[PDB]
Amino acid sequence: APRKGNTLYVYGEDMTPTLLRGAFSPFGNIIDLSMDPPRNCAFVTYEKMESADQAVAELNGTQVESVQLKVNIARKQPM
Predict the structure, then answer these.
(1) What's the angle, vertex CA 21, arms to CA 70 and CA 41, rounded to 5?
(2) Using alpha carbons only, what angle is made at residue 59 by residues 17 and 72, rounded to the nearest 5 degrees?
(3) For residue 74, what is the domain's CATH number?
(4) Which ranges of 6-64 does DSSP label H, i.e. alpha helix?
(5) From 15, 17, 48, 57, which residue has the greatest number of CB atoms within 10 Å?
(6) How far is CA 67 from the centre of its chain?
(7) Are strands 33-36 and 41-45 parallel, antiparallel or unpaired?
(8) CA-to-CA distance for 68 and 28, rounded, in angstroms?
């Protein structure tokens, strides 16, 4: 049966897939990975709800070689 799953909202500047994959690869396996180049945002889906909460708490409040990323939760209401 289908499950709601748990997609996380990722925001930041100059963000790439290889970088995000590593920012969510070790946090757990992703069933689907999406990225938004027009809004500079990215979406991360986790098969385990704990993989999203553990990655959102560890990824949230972090910095890169010289950039800052932001993790948020998708709104229940559809855009």
Answers:
(1) 35
(2) 85
(3) 3.30.70.330
(4) 17-24, 49-59
(5) 15
(6) 16
(7) antiparallel
(8) 21
Tokens found for residue 53: 């909460």
H-type helices in 1-79, by residue range? 17-24, 49-59
Strand order in the sheet with 41-45: 33-36, 41-45, 7-11, 70-73
Name the phi and psi angles at 70, rounded to 5: -135, 130
| Number of other CB atoms surrounding residue 35 within 10 Å | 15
Tokens of 65: 């070689």
Residue 57 domain boundaries: 1-79
Question: What's the number of domains the chain is made of?
Answer: 1
